[PDB]
């Protein structure tokens, strides 16, 4: 533990050991000072231009957290190609974390001349929330992850939480959390910090698409022994009367055969086309969207439950808020074009799940009689019925990994809608902050708190190692499969590589489901 | 491990132990920052002025490597005189490497006043590629070696590689290598780095010239028992007719005797003279050169295979691209004069190898009859025949040492054409880089990567120790040999010494082959 | 399949220390005569570099 | 006996894949008359190593 | 597979009426050139003597 | 010998001397009752199938 000795080594590697894979990643961070070492209250009112659907109340802290809840922070694009091509499932087992090589520097601004010098005696504060006594921010899909490309230097986010509100006003059950009421460890330069975590039991992630559909599970050569009603009216001529006729399911009437299972649930959404000439000439993004109503607030169901995107030969349709939409390099924040984003498609799960822009089915409406025709009724949203089967949404190379299940009384199939692994005890948050150093205090005493500080920042390394467990492919299919490949022809720049200016870019989203298993 | 303690000692010595020699060399390096910590794509197109023979595609990295693949980095000019005068061969056995005394400094430019101050807490990154997972740059004869003279301070090169191309455009099999995806060690000031390597089994380097030729291996006093066809036409007068006459090889017809072996291969080149009045009045360096055609590219066969340079009494001729050409002190890059370069000559191997500017032989062309004269045909390039013998190209005091054999399916006598030792597992590359240190980040969060850094550089020592194995001279020759000597008469400055301004210079190339062995 | 070719195994950023014959005829005008000129292999004349 | 792939390439490789769009018959399968057929030659060299 | 190497030579007949009326033992022979000396490739590499 | 086109006939070329190609096989010359037995291989850097 000295100033002339490094406290870690740059580990960044991945090994494959048959039924495991251990990945390591190491980046370089830099931490500013937030809020000038102050806690602040933030809120937004119904007054002005804001509406009732967008009010909030909460706090903003001087601390900063670490968010590595994303898939490409650990996997190189080659190592993601090895994973999706040969494996039917993967789940994580344990992780490890390590901070080292802390450097604290100060900056002095005089007459426009900026001078940056070392400060050998200042500290930082790091700790983990192991007992889950804070709000949980990760898993709400925010920015500020580790960079995809290891040769980048990133910036640490800011921590802030939310509580209850009535408009822009707090109520009696609001809560104020002081992060300095927790035991934390202080590090001068030449110290390090590390801990160890172990994931709980979690089901595998289905990295396959079914090669068989629910309504085509029978035998094409044998009739059934089990009848169905087929005819009610005779066919002699003008004098058609009532009758009861029955028949058997066979090879040619395969929509009438008796079946054992149902498709998954359906919560129908609006269909919009990427060819712009086929849409309506109106602004229907918010007025026609699929919402849900909680506490007098219309929040948007986004992306909703896991349903299929489009049926066959209709690749130009997508639900208005039903897919994950990823942005390319240098896309603007507001009003990006169509060619600046990348649309993901969930077409693999159309064998069991319903289509997100079409109805679930048709049910009856009245009691038919001799003088009353039978009426039908279309169901738009259908809850869970006994005998249903479904699939979850796929994970991506740049998608999230885990989310925290809220500590409630009950839940129903707790998988996150954005995909990944639903945990009841997620990895803990890691909060970091520079300790304040005051400027010169006055010579005479004054009871007020000090508000003149030395402006500082700090930088250093970080290392995350996660061990994954795999499930091998054990199929007896004769013809070849579908794999992920690179493009073959010549092009201006290499995909998944640097530019001529030095900006890394990802050309397309990469799914997971490429191998096939039967139902 | 502290700031007030050196971490190494200046070892620079050579010892002789009968059948070994252990040489050590120590220099002082300095490393800048490359590309401003960025990866970049570099290429060259057929458009503009460039041609199809000179296109490339590749990348440029922020790292820097160590190249000691040259003979004078380890051998003093005296110790090279001890080697070539008493030994018939030498090969290397093992090496050792050591970095120490790291100093990281920073520079701040304000109003033209340049101030350079210490930075006690910054690191560098060094590692070796032991498993050969990178492109191999060494052995392509580049600059940036250790200096010949130990009192110099040198500068570390930059790493960059090449891949496939179609013009100036990448194809599907191009590859992008991120050097930060390897495990590397970080060193503050007061740390050191060292490893150990062991060469594989490699044949000796023939440090001799043969004192006997292939076509003069017989006995000058005894005829042969084995005949040859000598006469076809009688010699009576006008009435000469056909006959068959035979004779024996003897002491006076020694070109007709039966012989056991062939000369080496031949790939003929163009002859040019240093006396300028004897050349053609045309520009024939590229249009008349000896090339080889790969993938629609005319690349120059340089220096081609090991052939002799000139026959006797013709010391003014040399092949246009068949010799290694070395530059003197302060030679220009483009259009140097004749008096600014030094031409090496391979005249020792004329006893077995063919001459590089003359043909290999004469073969038949048709089937002679009573009404058809026999025709002959000259062979310009000849592949390997059974029974051939040859010699390799010589190594020099300022020539390379090793080269990497490409990992392919087959090869034929894998010695490098520039001379030296063909290895399948060469010494590993050693890549070094300063870790980036950011400037002050903004107070509010921003997802973009940081691109404002503190400008730095770093310096320190380096030490290489290689052990060589020798093969002694065991001849029974009566008259004295030929040795390497210094000039005897008075002169203005000492050869192989410093100037009056302080610039070291090498006056002439020094070969190896001085002692003699019989065939 | 190899991802690298035989005539492109060098470094795109560093010249060589090893020369090659490049010019034989001068370029003043009508009175072009014989000369010997040499140069180094570099990043832009990569067909002229010395190869193994 | 096999020899595994031990490369550190960043971007993805080239693999052998099946065709994706709809077609009349499955490749590498039987006909409607019962004759097996191979549609194309399949090489071996798809992964890459440096020289 | 391929046949072995070939270094072609001149054909002469023992029936004397079928040869040329010239002295071609040295001027038409198969030689090899070493160090400015035309030595005779004798007997050369192992090739077959005559066909059927 | 060349590249045939719509307006260019294909040409052929006869090889008189051929070096070693991959996949060749050959035999050595026979020994005789009054022929030699051994020969010394010259101490050199390389050789190719050192039979006399």
UniProtKB/TrEMBL annotation, chain F:
Which residues are listed as membrane-spanning?
none
Q: Which domain of life is it from?
A: Viruses
Localization per record: Virion
Q: Name the residues that bind AMP.
A: 51
Give the record's family classification: Belongs to the parvoviridae capsid protein family.
Q: Indicate what this protein is called per its UniProt record.
A: Capsid protein
What is the covered span of the full protein? Answer: 584 to 635 of 738
């Amino acid at each position: 533990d000295g100033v002339g000795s490094s406290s870690g080594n740059w580990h960044c590697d991945s090994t494959w050991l048959g039924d495991r894979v251990i990945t390591t990643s190491t980046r370089t961070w830099a931490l500013p000072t937030y809020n000038n070492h102050l806690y602040k209250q933030i809120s937004n009112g119904t007054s002005g231009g804001a509406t009732n659907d967008n009010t909030y109340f909460g706090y903003s802290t001087p601390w900063g957290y670490f968010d590595f809840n994303r898939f490409h922070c650990h996997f190189s694009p080659r190592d993601w190609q090895r994973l999706i091509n040969n494996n039917w499932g993967f789940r994580p087992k344990r992780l490890s974390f390590k901070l080292f090589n802390i450097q604290v520097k100060e900056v002095t601004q005089n007459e426009g001349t900026k001078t940056i010098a070392n400060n050998l005696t200042s500290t930082i504060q790091v700790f983990t929330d192991s007992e889950y006594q804070l709000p949980y921010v990760l898993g709400s899909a925010h920015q500020g992850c580790l960079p995809p490309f290891p040769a980048d230097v990133f910036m640490i986010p800011q921590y802030g939480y939310l509580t209850l509100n009535n408009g822009s006003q707090a109520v009696g059950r609001s809560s104020f959390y002081c992060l300095e009421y927790f035991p934390s460890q202080m590090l001068r330069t030449g110290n390090n910090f590390q801990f160890t975590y172990t994931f709980e039991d979690v089901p595998f992630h289905s990295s396959y698409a079914h090669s068989q559909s629910l309504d085509r599970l029978m035998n094409p050569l044998i009739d059934q022994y089990l009848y169905y009603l087929s005819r009610t009216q005779t066919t002699g001529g003008t004098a058609n009367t009532q009758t009861l006729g029955f028949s058997q399911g066979g090879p040619n009437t395969m929509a009438n055969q008796a079946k054992n299972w149902l498709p998954g649930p359906c919560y129908r959404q609006q269909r919009v086309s990427t060819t712009t000439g086929q849409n309506n000439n109106s602004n229907f993004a918010w007025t026609a969207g699929t919402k849900y109503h909680l506490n007098g607030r219309n929040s948007l169901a986004n992306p909703g439950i896991a349903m299929a995107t489009h049926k066959d030969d209709e690749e130009r349709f997508f639900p208005s808020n039903g897919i994950l939409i990823f942005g390319k390099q240098n896309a603007a924040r507001d009003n990006a074009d169509y060619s600046d984003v990348m649309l993901t498609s969930e077409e693999e799960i159309k064998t069991t799940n319903p289509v997100a822009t079409e109805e679930y089915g048709i049910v009856a409406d009245n009691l038919q009689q001799q003088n009353t025709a039978p009426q039908i009724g279309t169901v738009n949203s259908q809850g869970a019925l006994p005998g249903m089967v479904w699939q979850n949404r796929d994970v991506y190379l740049q998608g999230p990994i885990w989310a925290k299940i809220p500590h409630t009384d009950g839940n129903f199939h707790p998988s996150p809608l954005m995909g990944g692994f639903g945990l009841k005890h997620p990895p803990p948050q890691i909060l970091i902050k520079n300790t304040p150093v005051p400027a010169d205090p006055p010579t005479t005493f004054n009871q007020s708190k000090l508000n003149s500080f030395i402006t500082q920042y700090s930088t250093g390394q970080v290392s995350v190692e996660i061990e994954w467990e795999l499930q091998k492919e054990n199929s007896k299919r004769w013809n070849p499969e579908i794999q992920y490949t690179s493009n073959y022809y010549k092009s201006t720049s290499v995909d998944f590589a640097v530019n001529t200016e030095g900006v890394y870019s990802e050309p397309r989203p990469i799914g997971t489901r490429y191998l096939t298993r039967n139902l």
